[PDB]
Amino acid sequence: GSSGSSGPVLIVTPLEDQQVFVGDRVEMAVEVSEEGAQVMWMKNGVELTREDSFKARYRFKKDGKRHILIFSDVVQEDRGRYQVITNGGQCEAELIVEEKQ
């Protein structure tokens, strides 16, 4: 925006390997160093655009310096590598999705 305040956005608390089962509640939260951060999520090398995506079922939640990614429904196909990238820092995680009994 206008000339006011700029700077890199370092990831205080990045993502971490999560072990869940198909059909559960997954919440990928991340702590940043700036509230209004333009953090971008990437899966298997795909920029998770923030536009009309009827296909997807996940919801975006911005709580200031924290970005959560709820997954109403998760499946084995959802298991990948969520690489978080920002204008200051980046990270990666491994979502382990296993089948139910």
Backbone as a printed PyTorch tensor [residue, N CA C, xyz], in Angstrom:
tensor([[[  0.8070,  -1.2070,   0.0000],
         [  0.0000,   0.0000,   0.0000],
         [  0.8420,   1.2600,   0.0000]],

        [[  0.2290,   2.3790,   0.3740],
         [  0.9290,   3.6580,   0.4120],
         [  2.1990,   3.5580,   1.2520]],

        [[  3.0500,   4.5750,   1.1500],
         [  4.3010,   4.6020,   1.8970],
         [  4.0400,   4.7900,   3.3880]],

        [[  4.2610,   3.7300,   4.1610],
         [  4.0440,   3.7980,   5.5940],
         [  5.0250,   2.9420,   6.3700]],

        [[  4.8560,   1.6250,   6.2850],
         [  5.7300,   0.6960,   6.9900],
         [  5.9230,  -0.5850,   6.1830]],

        [[  7.1800,  -0.9520,   5.9580],
         [  7.5020,  -2.1550,   5.1980],
         [  8.5050,  -3.0220,   5.9520]],

        [[  8.7210,  -4.2360,   5.4530],
         [  9.6560,  -5.1440,   6.0910],
         [  9.3130,  -6.6000,   5.8390]],

        [[ 10.3120,  -7.4820,   5.9950],
         [ 10.1340,  -8.9220,   5.7850],
         [  9.2680,  -9.5630,   6.8640]],

        [[  8.6030, -10.6570,   6.5090],
         [  7.7420, -11.3660,   7.4490],
         [  8.3210, -12.7310,   7.8040]],

        [[  9.0520, -12.7860,   8.9110],
         [  9.6630, -14.0310,   9.3630],
         [  8.6290, -14.9360,  10.0250]],

        [[  8.7310, -16.2340,   9.7620],
         [  7.8060, -17.2050,  10.3360],
         [  8.2590, -17.6400,  11.7250]],

        [[  7.5830, -17.1250,  12.7490],
         [  7.9130, -17.4630,  14.1280],
         [  7.6730, -18.9420,  14.4050]],

        [[  6.4470, -19.3930,  14.1600],
         [  6.0870, -20.7880,  14.3830],
         [  5.5750, -21.4350,  13.1020]],

        [[  6.4860, -22.0840,  12.3610],
         [  6.1490, -22.7580,  11.1030],
         [  5.2970, -24.0030,  11.3230]],

        [[  5.0510, -24.7440,  10.2480],
         [  4.2490, -25.9600,  10.3230],
         [  5.0980, -27.1430,  10.7800]],

        [[  4.4360, -28.2530,  11.0920],
         [  5.1300, -29.4550,  11.5410],
         [  4.3900, -30.7110,  11.0900]],

        [[  5.1290, -31.8060,  10.9470],
         [  4.5440, -33.0730,  10.5220],
         [  3.3370, -33.4300,  11.3850]],

        [[  2.2000, -33.6560,  10.7370],
         [  0.9740, -34.0050,  11.4450],
         [  0.4930, -35.3960,  11.0470]],

        [[  0.1770, -36.2160,  12.0450],
         [ -0.2950, -37.5730,  11.7980],
         [ -1.7750, -37.7050,  12.1410]],

        [[ -2.6120, -37.7850,  11.1120],
         [ -4.0520, -37.9150,  11.3050],
         [ -4.6250, -39.0270,  10.4350]],

        [[ -5.9230, -39.2720,  10.5760],
         [ -6.5940, -40.3110,   9.8030],
         [ -7.5650, -39.6980,   8.7980]],

        [[ -7.8460, -40.4380,   7.7300],
         [ -8.7600, -39.9690,   6.6950],
         [-10.1460, -39.6950,   7.2660]],

        [[-10.5900, -38.4470,   7.1570],
         [-11.8970, -38.0770,   7.6680],
         [-11.8300, -37.4920,   9.0650]],

        [[-10.8540, -36.6210,   9.2940],
         [-10.6820, -35.9900,  10.5970],
         [-10.5590, -34.4760,  10.4550]],

        [[-10.3460, -33.7970,  11.5780],
         [-10.2110, -32.3450,  11.5790],
         [ -8.7420, -31.9360,  11.6140]],

        [[ -8.3020, -31.2390,  10.5710],
         [ -6.9180, -30.7860,  10.4830],
         [ -6.8380, -29.2640,  10.4770]],

        [[ -6.0050, -28.7170,  11.3570],
         [ -5.8370, -27.2720,  11.4530],
         [ -4.3600, -26.8930,  11.4110]],

        [[ -3.9070, -26.4250,  10.2520],
         [ -2.5150, -26.0270,  10.0810],
         [ -2.3250, -24.5520,  10.4200]],

        [[ -1.8870, -24.2820,  11.6450],
         [ -1.6640, -22.9140,  12.0930],
         [ -0.1880, -22.5410,  12.0070]],

        [[  0.0830, -21.2590,  11.7830],
         [  1.4540, -20.7740,  11.6780],
         [  1.5850, -19.3720,  12.2620]],

        [[  2.6110, -19.1720,  13.0840],
         [  2.8490, -17.8750,  13.7080],
         [  3.8320, -17.0480,  12.8860]],

        [[  3.4040, -15.8540,  12.4890],
         [  4.2470, -14.9640,  11.6980],
         [  4.7420, -13.7900,  12.5330]],

        [[  5.4910, -12.8940,  11.8990],
         [  6.0310, -11.7260,  12.5850],
         [  5.3000, -10.4570,  12.1540]],

        [[  4.1540, -10.6340,  11.5050],
         [  3.3600,  -9.5030,  11.0370],
         [  1.8970,  -9.9020,  10.8610]],

        [[  0.9960,  -9.0600,  11.3580],
         [ -0.4340,  -9.3260,  11.2560],
         [ -0.8670,  -9.4210,   9.7960]],

        [[ -0.8920,  -8.2780,   9.1160],
         [ -1.2900,  -8.2540,   7.7210],
         [ -0.2340,  -8.8440,   6.8070]],

        [[  0.0010, -10.1460,   6.9390],
         [  0.9920, -10.8310,   6.1180],
         [  0.3410, -11.4910,   4.9070]],

        [[  1.0210, -11.4280,   3.7680],
         [  0.5070, -12.0190,   2.5380],
         [  1.0470, -13.4310,   2.3460]],

        [[  1.1560, -14.1730,   3.4440],
         [  1.6570, -15.5410,   3.3970],
         [  0.9470, -16.3510,   2.3170]],

        [[  1.7070, -17.1760,   1.6070],
         [  1.1500, -18.0070,   0.5460],
         [  1.4430, -19.4830,   0.8000]],

        [[  0.4040, -20.3070,   0.7370],
         [  0.5510, -21.7400,   0.9600],
         [  0.7570, -22.4790,  -0.3580]],

        [[  1.6390, -23.4730,  -0.3440],
         [  1.9250, -24.2590,  -1.5390],
         [  1.8550, -25.7520,  -1.2370]],

        [[  1.1760, -26.4940,  -2.1040],
         [  1.0360, -27.9360,  -1.9330],
         [  1.5490, -28.6820,  -3.1600]],

        [[  2.4850, -29.6000,  -2.9390],
         [  3.0580, -30.3850,  -4.0270],
         [  3.4940, -29.4820,  -5.1770]],

        [[  3.8320, -28.2380,  -4.8510],
         [  4.2620, -27.2950,  -5.8670],
         [  3.0970, -26.6150,  -6.5570]],

        [[  2.1420, -26.1340,  -5.7680],
         [  0.9690, -25.4580,  -6.3100],
         [  0.5360, -24.3040,  -5.4140]],

        [[  0.6340, -23.0860,  -5.9380],
         [  0.2520, -21.8980,  -5.1840],
         [ -1.2430, -21.9070,  -4.8760]],

        [[ -1.5760, -22.0850,  -3.6020],
         [ -2.9700, -22.1150,  -3.1730],
         [ -3.6170, -20.7410,  -3.3310]],

        [[ -4.0770, -20.4450,  -4.5430],
         [ -4.7180, -19.1670,  -4.8250],
         [ -5.8270, -18.8740,  -3.8210]],

        [[ -6.0840, -17.5910,  -3.5890],
         [ -7.1200, -17.1780,  -2.6500],
         [ -8.3230, -16.5970,  -3.3890]],

        [[ -8.8010, -17.3240,  -4.3940],
         [ -9.9460, -16.8790,  -5.1800],
         [-11.0520, -17.9300,  -5.1730]],

        [[-12.1160, -17.6660,  -5.9220],
         [-13.2430, -18.5890,  -6.0030],
         [-12.7670, -20.0000,  -6.3340]],

        [[-12.8570, -20.8940,  -5.3550],
         [-12.4310, -22.2770,  -5.5400],
         [-13.4750, -23.2450,  -4.9910]],

        [[-14.6150, -23.3230,  -5.6710],
         [-15.6950, -24.2090,  -5.2530],
         [-15.1780, -25.6250,  -5.0220]],

        [[-14.2410, -26.0510,  -5.8620],
         [-13.6620, -27.3840,  -5.7520],
         [-13.1780, -27.6510,  -4.3290]],

        [[-12.1730, -26.8950,  -3.8990],
         [-11.6220, -27.0470,  -2.5590],
         [-12.7230, -27.0110,  -1.5050]],

        [[-12.4410, -27.5860,  -0.3400],
         [-13.4080, -27.6210,   0.7500],
         [-12.8210, -27.0080,   2.0180]],

        [[-11.5360, -26.6750,   1.9680],
         [-10.8550, -26.0830,   3.1130],
         [-11.2310, -24.6140,   3.2710]],

        [[-11.0780, -24.0980,   4.4870],
         [-11.4020, -22.7050,   4.7710],
         [-10.1830, -21.9640,   5.3160]],

        [[-10.0700, -20.6860,   4.9710],
         [ -8.9520, -19.8680,   5.4240],
         [ -9.3380, -19.0540,   6.6550]],

        [[ -8.4500, -19.0310,   7.6440],
         [ -8.6950, -18.2900,   8.8760],
         [ -7.4810, -17.4470,   9.2540]],

        [[ -7.6650, -16.1320,   9.2810],
         [ -6.5860, -15.2150,   9.6290],
         [ -6.8320, -14.5790,  10.9940]],

        [[ -5.9980, -14.9340,  11.9650],
         [ -6.1240, -14.3960,  13.3150],
         [ -4.9350, -13.5040,  13.6570]],

        [[ -4.7900, -12.4090,  12.9170],
         [ -3.6920, -11.4910,  13.1570],
         [ -2.3610, -12.0450,  12.6900]],

        [[ -1.5030, -12.3980,  13.6410],
         [ -0.1890, -12.9440,  13.3220],
         [ -0.2240, -14.4690,  13.3040]],

        [[ -1.3830, -15.0260,  12.9680],
         [ -1.5470, -16.4730,  12.9120],
         [ -2.4920, -16.8710,  11.7820]],

        [[ -2.0520, -17.8100,  10.9510],
         [ -2.8590, -18.2770,   9.8290],
         [ -3.1790, -19.7620,   9.9730]],

        [[ -4.4610, -20.0750,  10.1250],
         [ -4.8980, -21.4580,  10.2720],
         [ -5.5860, -21.9560,   9.0050]],

        [[ -5.4440, -23.2480,   8.7300],
         [ -6.0540, -23.8490,   7.5500],
         [ -6.9100, -25.0520,   7.9320]],

        [[ -8.1920, -24.8040,   8.1810],
         [ -9.1180, -25.8670,   8.5540],
         [ -9.4410, -26.7580,   7.3580]],

        [[ -9.6700, -28.0390,   7.6280],
         [ -9.9910, -28.9950,   6.5750],
         [-11.2410, -29.7960,   6.9310]],

        [[-12.4050, -29.2140,   6.6650],
         [-13.6730, -29.8700,   6.9590],
         [-13.5700, -31.3760,   6.7410]],

        [[-12.8240, -31.7670,   5.7140],
         [-12.6420, -33.1790,   5.3950],
         [-11.2780, -33.4200,   4.7560]],

        [[-10.5250, -34.3610,   5.3160],
         [ -9.2010, -34.6890,   4.8010],
         [ -9.1530, -36.1190,   4.2760]],

        [[ -8.3630, -36.3350,   3.2300],
         [ -8.2270, -37.6580,   2.6340],
         [ -6.7710, -37.9650,   2.3020]],

        [[ -6.5110, -39.2000,   1.8870],
         [ -5.1590, -39.6210,   1.5390],
         [ -4.5890, -38.7510,   0.4230]],

        [[ -5.4750, -38.1830,  -0.3880],
         [ -5.0590, -37.3280,  -1.4950],
         [ -4.6310, -35.9540,  -0.9890]],

        [[ -5.0720, -35.6090,   0.2160],
         [ -4.7350, -34.3230,   0.8140],
         [ -3.3270, -34.3490,   1.4020]],

        [[ -2.7900, -35.5510,   1.5840],
         [ -1.4530, -35.7130,   2.1410],
         [ -0.3910, -35.2530,   1.1450]],

        [[  0.3710, -34.2340,   1.5300],
         [  1.4120, -33.7170,   0.6600],
         [  2.4670, -32.9340,   1.4200]],

        [[  2.9750, -31.8760,   0.7990],
         [  3.9980, -31.0440,   1.4230],
         [  3.5990, -29.5710,   1.3840]],

        [[  2.9880, -29.1010,   2.4650],
         [  2.5530, -27.7120,   2.5540],
         [  3.7360, -26.7860,   2.8210]],

        [[  4.2790, -26.2090,   1.7540],
         [  5.4140, -25.3020,   1.8720],
         [  4.9470, -23.8560,   1.9920]],

        [[  5.0830, -23.2930,   3.1880],
         [  4.6750, -21.9150,   3.4360],
         [  5.7560, -20.9340,   2.9950]],

        [[  5.3630, -19.9530,   2.1880],
         [  6.2990, -18.9500,   1.6950],
         [  5.7790, -17.5400,   1.9570]],

        [[  6.6710, -16.6590,   2.3990],
         [  6.3050, -15.2780,   2.6860],
         [  7.3310, -14.3060,   2.1140]],

        [[  7.1320, -13.0190,   2.3810],
         [  8.0410, -11.9880,   1.8930],
         [  9.2190, -11.8060,   2.8450]],

        [[  9.4830, -12.8270,   3.6540],
         [ 10.5820, -12.7600,   4.6000],
         [ 11.1590, -14.1250,   4.9150]],

        [[ 10.2830, -15.0990,   5.1440],
         [ 10.7320, -16.4430,   5.4570],
         [  9.8380, -17.5080,   4.8550]],

        [[ 10.2880, -18.7580,   4.9090],
         [  9.5210, -19.8700,   4.3630],
         [  9.7930, -21.1530,   5.1410]],

        [[  8.9170, -22.1370,   4.9740],
         [  9.0620, -23.4160,   5.6620],
         [  8.2930, -24.5150,   4.9350]],

        [[  8.4090, -25.7410,   5.4360],
         [  7.7260, -26.8790,   4.8320],
         [  7.3130, -27.8930,   5.8960]],

        [[  6.2800, -28.6710,   5.5930],
         [  5.7870, -29.6810,   6.5210],
         [  5.2860, -30.9130,   5.7760]],

        [[  5.1520, -32.0220,   6.4980],
         [  4.6830, -33.2680,   5.9020],
         [  3.4120, -33.7550,   6.5910]],

        [[  2.2930, -33.6710,   5.8800],
         [  1.0080, -34.1020,   6.4220],
         [  0.8030, -35.5990,   6.2100]],

        [[  1.0100, -36.3750,   7.2680],
         [  0.8440, -37.8220,   7.1990],
         [ -0.6200, -38.2150,   7.3610]],

        [[ -1.2190, -38.7090,   6.2810],
         [ -2.6160, -39.1260,   6.3040],
         [ -2.7400, -40.6380,   6.1530]],

        [[ -3.2980, -41.2840,   7.1720],
         [ -3.4750, -42.7320,   7.1520],
         [ -4.9540, -43.0970,   7.0640]],

        [[ -5.2290, -44.3260,   6.6350],
         [ -6.6020, -44.7990,   6.5040],
         [ -7.1530, -45.2510,   7.8540]],

        [[ -8.4730, -45.2130,   7.9900],
         [ -9.1280, -45.6180,   9.2280],
         [ -9.1800, -47.1380,   9.3440]],

        [[ -9.5980, -47.6250,  10.5080],
         [ -9.6930, -49.0600,  10.7460],
         [-10.9310, -49.6430,  10.0710]]])
